[PDB]
Amino acid sequence: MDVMNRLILAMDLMNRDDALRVTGEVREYIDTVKIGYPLVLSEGMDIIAEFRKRFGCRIIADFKVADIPETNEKICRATFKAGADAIIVHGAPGADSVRACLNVAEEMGREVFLLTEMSHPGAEMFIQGAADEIARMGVDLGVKNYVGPSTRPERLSRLREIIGQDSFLISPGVGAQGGDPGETLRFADAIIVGRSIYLADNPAAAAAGIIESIKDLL
Amino acid sequence: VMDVMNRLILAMDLMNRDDALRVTGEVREYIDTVKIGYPLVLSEGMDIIAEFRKRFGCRIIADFKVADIPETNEKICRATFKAGADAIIVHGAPGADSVRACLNVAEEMGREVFLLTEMSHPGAEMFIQGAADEIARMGVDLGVKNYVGPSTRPERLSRLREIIGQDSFLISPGVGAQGGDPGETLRFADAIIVGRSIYLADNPAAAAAGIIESIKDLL
Ligand SMILES: O=c1cc(O)n([C@@H]2O[C@H](COP(=O)(O)O)[C@@H](O)[C@H]2O)c(=O)[nH]1
Ligand SMILES: O=c1cc(O)n([C@@H]2O[C@H](COP(=O)(O)O)[C@@H](O)[C@H]2O)c(=O)[nH]1
């Protein structure tokens, strides 16, 4: 996956007008948008098609898929029907649940991203201790795309080590949660950035500034 | 706790409006509590919750297995309750802050959180099972009153009931298609969740009635 400026916008605004306006303001800096449940549950799955129509951007559906295999299959089918290019799936529920998603993605010409360790403090309670094993499970299953935490660069580096340089790794927690753009890109192919851009006084300037700070990495 | 008619919750995972409305309508004399998940919501929109309320007046549990960071969890719960869900199901695996975020919104909005501890499918054994007792204890510490645990592992369901105490509300999926037994599950759960055994039946009303007949002495 070729992400412009190694920067993925996490569009978690919850009304269509603001989401479209802000995305439009930063469109020159990106070609990949992560759309999650905050926007989808507020404005409907049709918002994915609207983004493709307006911006011609790649769409990653950040749905943290975390159900049994049968339900995971249905969620992936509905998601890809809406035009998502990729979907993010939790590794915690195990191999069968991930495989169900991989199967649908293969059938519809899409990608699965496996979320290993999460970026927030609560991740330390249960997920962190399983995260290396979840990553190895991804490798065993032939997963090529992964998500890991900007807020813990040593854990992000370990995830990169497990999955290899050939795998694709994206990383949230940059900015608002305390992760540094440039340090994160030592290990991740692309950074995910939400609030630092979409809550900024001037989202375009915010995006431009982040990119300026990683200029030598592009 | 919510008064679930016949201790039976429909998992309405059909993916088109017409079929989902037909089946739910056909079983409404038996079931006043419906679990609506992403298969139906992502296919038909959040307004499906509105339509179920309008047509059936059933309680709605939004099975969204909320599993994000606290900030995103809050947004998901807000959007879900705004649409009229009575309750939302939240994963415990992402830890205490993520659960607390959901509890805070539920409190502010006058709705309920259900905490998913262990899951019912085989893959649950890899990671979630080993954390489930602690996830449950965490729920109790946070003041969670409603829980979800697996019909398919009676020994685990029993332990989770012990941890949360008799006063907590426990619902349990995996009954029927996944192999769990209705009556056995109701030894520990307040209510059973049933999807395919009802919604794929030639006569969903008859399927629901049959399940209820089998647990008649437990009502
Ligand atoms: O571990 C993770 C995984 C995520 O997908 N995310 C997501 O990435 C985005 C982070 O946004 P922000 O830059 O505003 O902190 C949110 O949409 C969040 O749901 C995360 O923060 N941590
Ligand atoms: O551990 C769990 C948690 C669930 O919510 N579920 C949900 O409960 C329902 C089970 O449906 P069924 O009776 O068709 O197996 C599905 O909606 C599934 O997503 C589950 O099966 N196992």
Side-chain angles (χ1 to χ4, degrees):
Chain A
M1 184 174 303
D2 194 337
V3 173
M4 175 177 299
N5 290 320
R6 303 178 68 180
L7 175 65
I8 298 172
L9 175 65
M11 179 39 63
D12 298 314
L13 291 172
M14 296 172 74
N15 75 88
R16 184 182 155 268
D17 284 348
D18 293 337
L20 293 170
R21 184 177 46 80
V22 175
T23 303
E25 288 169 5
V26 307
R27 68 183 294 175
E28 70 188 296
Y29 302 110
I30 67 177
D31 66 359
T32 306
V33 179
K34 185 176 76 64
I35 295 180
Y37 284 136
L39 180 53
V40 158
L41 298 182
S42 295
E43 297 292 358
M45 289 289 276
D46 286 349
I47 197 67
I48 292 170
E50 186 157 21
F51 272 60
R52 286 178 65 155
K53 193 175 82 172
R54 299 204 47 167
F55 309 122
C57 54
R58 195 180 283 109
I59 299 292
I60 300 169
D62 180 9
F63 288 177
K64 303 284 192 306
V65 181
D67 220 301
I68 69 171
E70 287 83 353
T71 296
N72 277 13
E73 181 174 353
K74 295 183 182 72
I75 292 173
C76 293
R77 296 195 182 278
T79 299
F80 298 141
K81 285 181 176 290
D85 296 290
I87 197 170
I88 299 173
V89 177
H90 259 290
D96 55 355
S97 287
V98 177
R99 178 58 67 185
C101 302
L102 291 170
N103 290 340
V104 180
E106 191 170 19
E107 184 174 6
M108 305 188 60
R110 318 295 159 95
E111 299 290 330
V112 167
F113 279 73
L114 183 66
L115 175 60
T116 63
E117 182 172 334
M118 294 180 70
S119 63
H120 65 298
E124 299 184 340
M125 295 187 54
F126 310 113
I127 291 174
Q128 181 177 79
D132 284 11
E133 184 177 4
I134 292 169
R136 289 193 305 275
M137 174 191 71
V139 176
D140 287 338
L141 290 173
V143 173
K144 296 178 182 177
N145 304 291
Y146 295 81
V147 187
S150 173
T151 49
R152 301 187 193 96
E154 88 283 20
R155 296 293 303 136
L156 187 66
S157 171
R158 180 67 185 129
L159 171 59
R160 167 62 73 186
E161 288 179 342
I162 293 164
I163 68 179
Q165 303 293 155
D166 286 350
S167 294
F168 191 71
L169 174 57
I170 66 178
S171 181
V174 173
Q177 298 179 53
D180 180 82
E183 286 294 291
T184 302
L185 292 175
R186 291 172 62 193
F187 310 115
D189 296 279
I191 48 173
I192 293 162
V193 177
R195 286 164 288 170
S196 291
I197 293 172
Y198 74 69
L199 292 186
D201 289 316
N202 176 348
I210 291 172
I211 292 169
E212 172 67 15
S213 79
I214 61 173
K215 184 178 178 64
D216 292 344
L217 304 175
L218 306 178
Chain B
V1 304
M2 54 168 64
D3 184 6
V4 174
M5 185 177 293
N6 292 318
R7 302 181 72 181
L8 176 60
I9 297 172
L10 175 66
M12 178 34 62
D13 297 311
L14 292 174
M15 297 171 72
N16 72 89
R17 216 173 192 99
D18 290 340
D19 294 334
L21 293 168
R22 186 194 68 254
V23 172
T24 304
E26 285 174 5
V27 304
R28 188 57 186 78
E29 72 192 88
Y30 301 105
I31 294 171
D32 68 359
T33 306
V34 179
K35 185 176 77 61
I36 294 183
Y38 282 137
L40 180 51
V41 160
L42 300 183
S43 297
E44 294 288 356
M46 289 291 280
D47 74 345
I48 197 68
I49 295 171
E51 192 168 11
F52 270 56
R53 285 298 294 176
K54 177 178 181 178
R55 298 202 49 173
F56 316 121
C58 52
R59 294 186 201 87
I60 300 295
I61 297 170
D63 182 8
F64 289 175
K65 292 185 182 58
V66 184
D68 219 302
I69 68 172
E71 288 85 349
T72 296
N73 278 11
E74 291 191 23
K75 295 177 175 83
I76 293 171
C77 293
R78 293 191 180 282
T80 296
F81 295 140
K82 180 181 180 178
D86 295 281
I88 195 172
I89 301 174
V90 175
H91 257 292
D97 55 356
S98 288
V99 175
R100 187 177 300 109
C102 300
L103 290 171
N104 287 342
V105 178
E107 174 71 10
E108 167 186 338
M109 307 188 61
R111 304 292 163 81
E112 300 208 271
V113 166
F114 278 69
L115 184 67
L116 173 63
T117 62
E118 184 170 331
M119 293 178 71
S120 64
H121 67 296
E125 294 181 359
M126 298 187 62
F127 310 111
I128 290 174
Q129 180 174 86
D133 286 357
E134 186 171 356
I135 290 168
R137 190 161 77 249
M138 174 192 73
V140 173
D141 188 60
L142 293 179
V144 173
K145 296 178 301 180
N146 309 293
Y147 296 81
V148 186
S151 169
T152 52
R153 297 192 193 92
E155 71 284 2
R156 299 295 305 134
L157 190 64
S158 178
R159 180 64 189 133
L160 298 161
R161 166 58 76 184
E162 290 173 0
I163 293 167
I164 67 180
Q166 306 300 145
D167 286 350
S168 296
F169 193 65
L170 175 58
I171 66 179
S172 183
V175 175
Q178 297 178 56
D181 180 82
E184 290 181 11
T185 304
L186 292 175
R187 292 167 66 188
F188 312 114
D190 294 277
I192 49 174
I193 293 165
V194 180
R196 287 165 286 171
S197 290
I198 291 168
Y199 72 69
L200 295 181
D202 285 347
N203 186 345
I211 289 166
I212 294 166
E213 174 73 9
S214 82
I215 64 176
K216 186 174 180 58
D217 297 348
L218 310 182
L219 304 175

